[PDB]
Amino acid sequence: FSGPLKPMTFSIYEGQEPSQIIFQFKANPPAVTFELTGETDNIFVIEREGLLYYNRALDRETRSTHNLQVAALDANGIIVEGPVPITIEVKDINDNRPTFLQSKYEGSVRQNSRPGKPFLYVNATDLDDPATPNGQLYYQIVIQLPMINNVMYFQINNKTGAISLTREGSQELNPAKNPSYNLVISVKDMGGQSENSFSDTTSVDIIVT
């Protein structure tokens, strides 16, 4: 938990209240005191003894990296050593629900449209880290109304939110029989893979032409 002044990177989970110092910098005479600059945000502090710490739980969605610099000073306040870059990587936790860009979508599809060919897109946004499951979204049709004998007329690309006819929907959609369908779409984060995830829903009304 101590060592020379040099470029270093520390990884700290957002939402963790501090319990111990991050690091102690040691610098031989003529290193008197230490100075901390950069994206301190009144969170990151260095003491005279070279003790580096953070004073409150971070939030990746306020700042996802804190670019700091540490320098060793002498008696006259004059830089002796560094300034060196000290990087804080604020590790993501799943603390944001995914939200649909619309609570209601209005679409239309032609009667004999190709199966798999998109005619509408639903999208959601998640403020968590997209390089992690926390920010990786999975789209599902949860309801089709009306639905005949459990045959799905519509399918959604689970990654992209692209809504297209199924094989059966291509074959069966007939505006005279039924001019419109309502889909309820879910989105989950954690890539749709957990129970331990957040979810949103939207409604899509679709006219058959």
Binding site for a copy of itself (CB under 8 A): 11, 91-92, 129, 131-133, 138-141, 149-152, 155-158, 166-167, 191-195
Binding-site partner at residue 140 among Ca ion, a copy of itself, none, CB < 5 to 8 Å by type: a copy of itself
Smallest distance from the beta carbon of 54 to a copy of itself, in angstroms?
A: 18
* Per CB under 5 A, 96 contacts Ca ion: yes
Q: Choose between 79 and 177: whose C-beta lies nearer to a copy of itself.
A: 177
Round to whole Å and give the CA distance between 88 and 16: 14
Closer Cβ to Ca ion, 78 or 131, answer by number? 131
Quick one: DSSP state of residue 192?
A: G
Q: Which residues on adjacent β-strands are paired with residue 71?
A: 35
52: exposed, middle or buried (Cβ count in 10 Å: 0-12, 13-18, 19+): buried
Assess contact for 196 and 167: CB atoms under 8 A. no
Residue partners of 25: CB distance under 8 A and separation at least 6 = 2, 3, 4, 5, 34, 46, 50, 52, 70, 72
- Residue 79 CB, shortest distance to a copy of itself, in Å, is 27
Which of Ca ion, a copy of itself, none binds 47 (CB below 5-8 Å, type-dependent)?
Answer: none
Q: Which is nearer to a copy of itself, 46 or 156 (CB)?
A: 156
- Cα(66)–Cα(73) distance, rounded to whole angstroms? 22
Among 39, 59, 168, 172, binds Ca ion (CB under 5 A): 59
